[PDB]
């Protein structure tokens, strides 16, 4: 009777709050899986240097291509919203809720979306440019170890992002179920 009002109000919170979180986790996870595939390929792009014997040979070209394709695939795959677009202020509120580490407000058609923040990949591509080129590059130990400390930084940033996004979605689940109770208690 007047619980149909509660049913509707709960459903709408699910639609405007929880479903947004579910979709942001799903989009980011898909990007991270693809990034993990790039990481899984890296060991095969690395081999021992030569004249002898403290150096590493890196197929910087194969790595650049893999990172570039990752970026292109996730250009028009927002964290929010799943369909169509929203208003610039609407995107900024969700940016805040999700975090500026995870997302980036970006323009699309007549509106705005919160895209995946690809800055860690952007950072990787820059270093690779500094090398200087084009896959088969030979780096001495200190140089490789320096390039790597930066690249690992990026790979552990994206890992932390995913983990925190999931924790923060785990929270929104608890917050919703809580509300769901507080509104059933009206009966």
Give the residues across from 57 on adjacent strands.
Answer: 47, 138
Q: Toward its own copies, which CB reaches closer, 46 or 111?
A: 46
Task: Give the nearest distance from C-beta 152 to its own copies in angstroms.
Answer: 7
> Which residues in 77-106 contact its own copies (CB under 8 A)?
99-101
Residue 80: name the closest of 24, 17, 10 by CA: 24
Contact region with its own copies (CB under 8 A), list: 34-42, 65-73, 84-92, 107-115: 34-42
For residue 32, the tally of other CB atoms under 10 A from its CB is 17
Q: If you ran DSSP here, which 8-state letter would residue 45 be given?
A: G
The nearer residue to its own copies, 22 or 61, going by C-beta atoms, is 22
Separation between Cα atoms, residue 157 and residue 163, nearest integer Å = 10
Question: What is the nearest approach in angstroms of its own copies to the Cβ of residue 78?
Answer: 15
Binding to its own copies in span 110-169, by CB under 8 A = 119-120, 123-124, 126-127, 130-131, 140-157, 159-164, 166-169
Give the integer Cα–Cα distance in Å for 85 and 114: 9
């Amino acid at each position: 009777e007047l619980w149909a009002k509660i049913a509707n109000s709960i459903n709408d919170i699910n639609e405007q709050y929880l479903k947004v979180y579910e979709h942001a986790v799903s989009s980011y996870t898909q990007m991270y899986q693809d990034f993990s595939a790039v990481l899984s390929s890296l060991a095969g792009w690395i081999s021992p240097g030569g004249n002898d014997g403290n150096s590493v040979k890196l197929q910087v070209n194969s790595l650049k291509k893999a990172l570039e394709e990752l970026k292109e695939k996730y250009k028009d795959k927002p964290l929010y919203p799943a369909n169509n677009t929203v208003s610039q202020e609407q995107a900024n509120k969700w940016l805040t809720e999700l975090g500026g580490t995870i997302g980036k407000v970006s323009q699309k058609n007549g509106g705005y979306v919160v895209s995946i923040n690809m800055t860690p990949i952007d950072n990787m591509l820059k270093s690779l440019d500094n090398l200087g080129g084009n896959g088969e590059v030979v780096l001495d130990n200190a140089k490789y170890q320096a390039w790597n400390a930066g690249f690992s930084a990026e790979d552990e940033t994206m890992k932390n992002n995913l983990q925190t996004l999931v924790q923060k979605y785990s929270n929104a689940n608890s917050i919703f179920d809580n509300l769901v109770k507080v509104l059933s208690s009206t009966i």
